[PDB]
Amino acid sequence: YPKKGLSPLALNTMDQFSSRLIPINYDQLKKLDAGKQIKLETTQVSGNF
Amino acid sequence: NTYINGMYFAPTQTNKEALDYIQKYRVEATLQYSGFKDIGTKDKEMRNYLGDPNQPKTNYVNLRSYFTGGENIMTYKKLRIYAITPDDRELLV
């Protein structure tokens, strides 16, 4: 998801109803522009059948 | 007396991508008293080259942010690089 010939999806919010873009404070911003890169993980996925 | 504040290291050439691979710098400098001492490491930052707001961003050694109380003179010092796993060596005087 999505198909292979199409661009990937994006997330930029975090609320129940989509607003309030995700904040990052000063020290994390400096270490982020220091060259270090963030990592991402999956915890649990629910759906239906 | 002239004192050294920082280093706007390597303004953007036509090709410098290897500077994006670098994360830590390490410096040994001469203090005003008991010169040529080893100082630890920091991380590089982004600053506009020569302070001009119409310029690309480069790597900057912020030499004030170290384990020093005194200043720096125009005499001998060394500057080593850390790539992410190994150690390299670049600058001297």
Add this chain to the structure above:
Amino acid sequence: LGDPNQPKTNYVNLRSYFTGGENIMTYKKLRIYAITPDDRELLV
């Protein structure tokens, strides 16, 4: 010309290029880029 009541034209900032000094009234050239091919507009 920096007028607040005028259209917005093209502009070439020469200062945001890979330089350290300044430029003088001497040999200079300015070349276009179209989307696919190449061309040239200005000389001295």
